[PDB]
Amino acid sequence: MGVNAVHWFRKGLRLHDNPALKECIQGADTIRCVYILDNVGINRWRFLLQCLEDLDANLRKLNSRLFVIRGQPADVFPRLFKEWNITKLSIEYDSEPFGKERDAAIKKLATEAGVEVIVRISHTLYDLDKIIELNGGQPPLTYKRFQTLVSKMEPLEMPADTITSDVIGKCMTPLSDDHDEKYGVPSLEELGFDTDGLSSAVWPGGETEALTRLERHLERKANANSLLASPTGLSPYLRFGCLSCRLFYFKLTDLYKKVSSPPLSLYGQLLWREFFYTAATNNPRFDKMEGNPICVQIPWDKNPEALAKWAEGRTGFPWIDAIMTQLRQEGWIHHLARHAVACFLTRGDLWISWEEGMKVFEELLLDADWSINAGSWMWLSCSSFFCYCPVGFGRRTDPNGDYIRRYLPVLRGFPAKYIYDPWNAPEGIQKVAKCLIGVNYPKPMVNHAEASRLNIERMKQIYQQ
Amino acid sequence: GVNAVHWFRKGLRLHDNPALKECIQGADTIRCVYILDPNVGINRWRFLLQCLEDLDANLRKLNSRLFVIRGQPADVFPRLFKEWNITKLSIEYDSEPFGKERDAAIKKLATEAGVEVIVRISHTLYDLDKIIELNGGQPPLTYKRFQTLVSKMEPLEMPADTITSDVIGKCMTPLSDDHDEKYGVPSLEELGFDTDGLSSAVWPGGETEALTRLERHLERKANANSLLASPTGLSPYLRFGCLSCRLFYFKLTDLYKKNSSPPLSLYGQLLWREFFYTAATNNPRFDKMEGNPICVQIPWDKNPEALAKWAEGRTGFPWIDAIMTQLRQEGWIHHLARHAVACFLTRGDLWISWEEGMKVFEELLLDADWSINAGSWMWLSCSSFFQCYCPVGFGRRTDPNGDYIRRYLPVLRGFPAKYIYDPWNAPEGIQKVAKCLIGVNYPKPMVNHAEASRLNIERMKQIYQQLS
Ligand SMILES: Cc1ccc(-n2nc3c(c2NC(=O)c2ccc(C)c(C)c2)CSC3)c(C)c1
Ligand SMILES: Cc1ccc(-n2nc3c(c2NC(=O)c2ccc(C)c(C)c2)CSC3)c(C)c1
Helix, strand or coil: CCCEEEEEECCCCCCCCCHHHHHHHCCCCEEEEEEEECCCCHHHHHHHHHHHHHHHHHHHCCCCCEEEEECCHHHHHHHHHHHCCCCEEEEECCCCHHHHHHHHHHHHHHHHCCCEEEEECCCCCCCHHHHHHHCCCCCCCCHHHHHHHHHHCCCCCCCCCCCCHHHHCCCECCCCCCHHHHHCCCCCHHHCCCCCCCCCCCCCCCHHHHHHHHHHHHHHHCCCHHHCCCCCCCHHHHHHCCCCHHHHHHHHHHHHHHCCCCCHHHHHHHHHHHHHHHHHCCCCCCCCCCCCCCCCCCCCECCHHHHHHHHCCCCCCHHHHHHHHHHHHHCCCCHHHHHHHHHHHHHHCCCECHHHHHHHHHHHCCCCCHHHHHHHHHHHCCCCCCCCCCCHHHHHHCCCCHHHHHHCHHHCCCCCCCCCCHHHCCHHHHHHCCCCECCCECCCCCCHHHHHHHHHHHHHHHHHC | CCEEEEEECCCCCCCCCHHHHHHHCCCCEEEEEEEECCCCCHHHHHHHHHHHHHHHHHHHCCCCCEEEEECCHHHHHHHHHHHCCCCEEEEECCCCHHHHHHHHHHHHHHHHHCCEEEEECCCCCCCHHHHHHHCCCCCCCCHHHHHHHHHCCCCCCCCCCCCCHHHHCCCECCCCCCHHHHHCCCCCHHHCCCCCCCCCCCCCCCHHHHHHHHHHHHHHHCCHHHHCCCCCCCHHHHHHCCCCHHHHHHHHHHHHHCCCCCCHHHHHHHHHHHHHHHHHCCCCCCCCCCCCCCCCCCCCECCHHHHHHHHCCCCCCHHHHHHHHHHHHHCCCCHHHHHHHHHHHHHHCCCECHHHHHHHHHHHCCCCCHHHHHHHHHHHCCCCCCCCCCCCHHHHHHCCCCHHHHHHCHHHCCCCCCCCCCHHHCCHHHHHHCCCCECCCECCCCCCHHHHHHHHHHHHHHHHHHHC
8 A cells, every 4th residue: 555666776876867766756655776686797796786885875864775686677576566565666768778678578567567667768868769760760870970960959958856855755765674684785705706805996886986076077177197097087987877977968068168069079978978879779789790780790710719818818918918907907998998909809910709809898897888888899890880009009108118017017027128028028138027928928929910911901801892 | 774754744645745755765764654743623633534544555555654653743753763763854844833833843853863854845836935035025915916926936847756666766664563553543532532423524534535536626627506515625635735736736737728828817726825824934923913913903802602602603693503513514614604704703793803713713624724714814804914794695695595504504494495594583483383493492693783793894994094
């Protein structure tokens, strides 16, 4: 009896600009926010778990708690509907095809149980289906066309009001005394992860951290060092929904006017994100080659041993290996570093499928969703949307090689003259550095000049086809 | 003639035994001895005695025997030197401070008697002193720096040749027909133990068992069940020396190669061993809080009754009690189960000193040496190395049906999975049909976890504010 509401957290792990949760509370006697735990690496799971602990803490401020439940949503929700006597369920819209299919299945389960479902857009700046409509029923496959469509859209509506005590009103959350025992956020070890020797996260999760960084980021806006994680970086918080894209949009617009009509390059980060979400939303095989209508079909090498050396940073190229080590250790690498390793794996040196690189980035990268990961890997491998040197790229960006020394400590003894090509160092240099190439650090896995010359010919064959 | 003794302590094996190999060279006679030197529980003693009978049986294949002697080494060895007219003594090096002090005293006594002492490294992958020298004179206290040091060392030389007929050559072992009466391996009852109702060992000791399980482990390598002892587990055989760390290292590399550059993660089990041995070797108070230069001073509770409930698996938390029951009964628990009970006792629930948990583990755990035990307990209690699990939720997450609980806490077998991890929440009618009244046939929880852990988190946060 009564109006009992559940808001389902997946993305949008925040209380600000949360229109679905705002609407779910309206007219509700009770409210319960739930997160349901279904390649994913340990840095992704730690960021998520920290996101849920920050949500729980913020909900405690409102005399509520987060409910964490393990299971598959299709089995879990029929039980919750009855146990809690639910009449309304709310979600932030998910544009990605697998999320679409999951949410369509839950909507059917909810309707059959008599539960009304509130769906609101708030993970993207725009209604992706409306952009596709203005473009004639197909997503744009060029960024400039996307810019044209966006510039004709209506102005962005204001972000939804933050969930506070005034919004909650008389709505309450029923809680047992053993809430943590049944619904608490688990630790990594409670999920069976090996955390031995794990250091403190370079990217701590949560809306609180995201809003702290947003304020520091904007105050700052008002190279070798670029390779390292910035304390005001926002990319993972946008992927998990800790930071609203619309709030970030409006704060940037507000800053720009304080210091007219801003160029759309002002929103370059947000717009590239929307582009890939829009391209992917109606393409269930967007993350594949075969069966993907927009993906060029290319005969990639099948080489699991070469793939493993790339994935684990054992290529013998310190520039490539340091990037993949920072990626694995911390979960974020510079955009141009993503270019560098993606080129090395696919069209550049190894000629391995972009699907394999995408799968590694899905496990390790914090800030790249399914759509953005698939679209970027297709783009950089010349597979859709119409060769870096693994020595010179790093040497030009960081001549002293401090980046290599930070993430490949075994190379720390090498001078800047050989830090990016240690195989060229004389034996005496290697001995004083206590690192014999081919013993303490591997030899380069390919001759870059020979491999790149071959692959360049292969793709020219593809594109003359 | 040249009469030699090889002193077994660790390294209870004939393969990759450089000290024994060097001792045999140029010797006319050889005698292998183990000295039973007066907390160690019955499962540790049984594993040891099975290692010694495997050693004795493998020495019989070479027309030799193991000589087992009860006494203190500083008293026994002056007698043996004269009785057997010994001029050669060999040992595998012991990095741990108490073993270091003992061996220095025996080396002095041997020199006084005119006996040369042969010492060879073979219990650890590396020369721990060479690691510390490379680091500038102090051990690394982060595992990342230790990995950096290890990746700069020379490649490991191959393990020593197995003691065979060929290696023994002309050397021989004088034997009497009364050998078992004088020097035999004793039984547990013969050491005064109560073995009534003891079931057959889940972890049988010895080099033969170790090498069998190594072969199966390599083949297999080529969840709720994780909690149970694996038939291919190697951890206790590495602690006792039935299996060489260096042999394991080389079989792992060979399996990997059949790339030439495996990540260090491949050898993860071995390097964490080496890390704690290195940290402990020059620290004679490594197992203490006061007077230990690397350990944060924390005002732990003194509560012997709560410690006893934890040690004996009477906490009232079935996940905790099942783990401690498996540990007592078999001598091995999963690594994550060790985290669970360590957090419950120290930083999590009871606020009892990590020194007390280490002493219980020292008595019951088969696979954790002094250095690894002390280092792990300091680590998990946030007391060193620059460092809260739910006692209901963790088990429920790991084994939802509760089969682990039903296996080790049979009084709870009747409870459904819904309450098997928190049986105090079960309605009385469930408790009645399960024939286990909570507070009568199985104790109530000894603490309110939510209240205890919240207060102890605040205690620890104050500790690190004082430090900062
Ligand atoms: C309370 C307690 C006592 C002992 C052991 N324990 N027992 C054995 C070993 C270890 N420790 C570890 O592996 C280890 C590795 C990394 C880190 C960061 C820690 C904290 C422990 C390796 S050999 C057999 C454990 C796991 C917990
Ligand atoms: C291999 C790889 C995977 C993923 C990402 N990656 N990660 C994140 C984002 C993106 N892609 C882009 O920005 C982007 C924009 C324009 C073009 C033409 C391309 C090719 C990528 C935006 S949000 C966080 C990148 C940079 C490379």
